[PDB]
Amino acid sequence: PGIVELPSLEDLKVQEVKVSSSVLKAAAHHYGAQCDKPNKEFMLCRWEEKDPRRCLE
Amino acid sequence: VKQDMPPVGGYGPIDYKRNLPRRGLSGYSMFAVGIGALLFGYWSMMRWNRERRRLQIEDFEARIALMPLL
Secondary structure (H helix, E strand, O other): OOOOOOOOHHHHOOOOOOOOHHHHHHOHHHHHHHOHHHHHHHHHHHHHHOOHHHOOO | OOOOOOOOOOOOOOOOOOOOOOOOOOHHHHHHHHHHHHHHHHHHHHHHHHHHHHHHHHHHHHHHHHOOOO
């Protein structure tokens, strides 16, 4: 029936936070305090769009 | 003559009746001890369960903060 429209692999090529679970957990409270605005923006647009192909920026 | 004979004064008294001691606390005492132990355990479990709930809430909010990157 329909066709899928997948994003290119170049757009997904982005450097990562290459850390562990314990490092993320140790600074979890301060990351959630300082960096609330972009995280909340991403969570809201993911909740209201429901499409990861449009939720990359 | 010499023969097997009891001594001049005879043998001593020998106990032959039952002797139970009758010992331990009264039942009110063990009931009070058990009730007090119950109350102490209830209080300690109450305090530690409240502290555990606080720690679980802290861990859950750390997880919620960590979610968007994952």
